[PDB]
Scaffold this motif. Sequence first.
Motif: not given
Lengths: 428, 427
Positions: A298-300, A324-326, A409-412, A304-307
């Motif tokens: 996820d690109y958040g 979650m892996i941030f 898997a979270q971030g960008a 907020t988006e992470v939320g």
Amino acid sequence: VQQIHFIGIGGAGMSGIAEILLNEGYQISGSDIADGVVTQRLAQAGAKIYIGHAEEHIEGASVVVVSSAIKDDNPELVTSKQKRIPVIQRAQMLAEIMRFRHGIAVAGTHGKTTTTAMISMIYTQAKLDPTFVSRYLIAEADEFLHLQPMVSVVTNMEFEKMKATYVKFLHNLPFYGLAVMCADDPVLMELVPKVGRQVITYGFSEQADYRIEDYEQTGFQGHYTVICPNNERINVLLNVPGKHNALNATAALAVAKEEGIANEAILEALADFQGAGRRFDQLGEFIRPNGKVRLVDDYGHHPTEVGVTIKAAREGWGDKRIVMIFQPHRYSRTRDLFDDFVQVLSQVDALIMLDVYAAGEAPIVGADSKSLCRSIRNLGKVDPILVSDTSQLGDVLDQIIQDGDLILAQGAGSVSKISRGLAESWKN
Amino acid sequence: QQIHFIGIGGAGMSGIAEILLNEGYQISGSDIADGVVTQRLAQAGAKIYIGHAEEHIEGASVVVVSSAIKDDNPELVTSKQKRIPVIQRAQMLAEIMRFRHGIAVAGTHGKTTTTAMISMIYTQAKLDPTFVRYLIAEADEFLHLQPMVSVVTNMEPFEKMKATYVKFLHNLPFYGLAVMCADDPVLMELVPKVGRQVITYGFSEQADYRIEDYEQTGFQGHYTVICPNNERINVLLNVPGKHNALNATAALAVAKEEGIANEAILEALADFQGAGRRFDQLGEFIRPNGKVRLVDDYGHHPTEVGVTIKAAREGWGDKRIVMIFQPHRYSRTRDLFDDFVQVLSQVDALIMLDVYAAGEAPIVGADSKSLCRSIRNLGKVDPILVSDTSQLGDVLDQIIQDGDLILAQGAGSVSKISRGLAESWKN
């Protein structure tokens, strides 16, 4: 009239109308201070574009279209008035373009963009080849009074002057026109009597012309039924989350049927309607030694988006554990929104933190991943694990996994490069 | 697909209905009264319910209402109750103009006549235009109007107004046309803010379509018109006055700019018969003391009465000008009182009627007994006030002289009076 001149044709807002007019057959010319993607494009399509505003640039034009980006002082603007030439604004021009065209206008506080897309996705599949921003024109109406659409949606309103503004806006429908409104919004419903055009409602509401019942969200997909006005049932499969999207695809569905499109198309479009980017991308379910887990990308990267993504997932299943892996992107950001990050990221069940992806930035003391982790650990809602050598990720993961874990898997940053390599391993 | 009209009988409502029908929609409508219209309509395929009853709303999609429908109406309350949209008259009318090639005529004075002239022009060109694919219509200060051409004949009693015309001018498409009178400064002064091609007309050196060599002979006007290619056209106008010349020209300019042939235009204006109640000749009658001419005019403001006056003089050689004048509204009389004295003092004999209230209460000092006096004190003509309409014929016969031109002047019931008078005199 045969030649149209745009002053500052490369500004967004202009190129678009210019391209439309160009395919219509008009002659097009304009000017701008910079030659780039846009100007080169229009240019190869047949426009004559100068660089730099010059008083000789008006010759031949019959009308001259200008932005509020253009200023009182522009030589082209100035010269035109002197030469009689009618100078009109981007807005009026856009309205013109609608007048002889069948345009759908998406307005409201929330949902405009997605609805607009949802409708275009639909007309497209329908083989209608619509134009969006054949003869169909799908456009996003943002709070405007100029637009002269034949269909207009208002998704929601969430002051008396604003209220009046919308009323003015719907008034522009033709007598035979359509307003599609959200039944679930009281403000809206309160305005119906004042509208003076045909009105179609859609919603969960008791009284919706197009009614949604039994909606259920499975993972990042939505499931529901809609009851058209003649009591015919349509079972929808929506490839994005939340009731709110159900609402927007139902504005879409509503708009679509009532111009006569096969349920097949409607349904197909939606089935295959992404969020326009890297959101809720499911990479695969995998059986590991400690369990079967879904791994989603996820690109958040902003709190907020992470939320939204976590809430989505929560609603997604309802008992699944979210691991979650941030990877925080940028030091600046983590510094600016640190406390916010601690909160959101403490909303998951297990958290592994990657090191900040710097994006260019030199590290900032106390705005890094150890720093987040500690702050998070102090909250005590979740005890994070920090993984600086991603080479180790798959192993740390396999040790904390639990049957039926969703792993975000979270971030960008390179986070999606990393999660994909994690699938490759697992695949082997 | 169904349009229902509440009170379809009204003219203004029938027009739109009829047009809506030939377009191919499906019309129904109601009226308390049967009649010419309704049968005419019914006969084209209109479902006319004589009388209002919430059941006449069957299978409609929208309800067109005039400005004469009120709070108690049965079809109105259920309409609202049944979620059926209610549209008024013009918007409903503006809609029609949209996909059409409307030519809308606007302004202070000359609308009525200009639209007429324009219609006869296109008629003569064998264009078969609709008037009230072409659509020629009169627009009275009108922002819903979506026309391809709009004329603005003049603007005279403000900034607020000016701004309105401007916006009106705007409703034109980018590629549209504004035809405005060049001899009027205010107009000529808004020009810039148009944002659309403007063609001008008139007597003034800078006229796109310019008038030269104007001379009224008989009650017909002769003059030559300089089109934009300095191409010359001599015009024979069957109606008097420079005012009408102006009107005819703006009519010519629209035609010219649309590519119509000079021969069809010249024929059109030479063949003009006059708009009702506008220097309308009701004929010659032999009375015991003179053969006189009776003319019915609308002019209520003082400038309009003026032109009317100058107009008649220009075509009545040595003979007398006699007027029967009826102020319209107590308010206007007071506003422009002095000017009324000035202009009314320019005729040879004056009969004054009482003010036509149009609703107002009397204002002290602003009725006709007051005008008379003022007028008298001026001493150019000695007015006679005639309060008892029944006495008009008699008082008229007492002051008439062979050869008089009698002007029945005004906007109120004066026209109806005059016609009765004529009728009476015919028999």
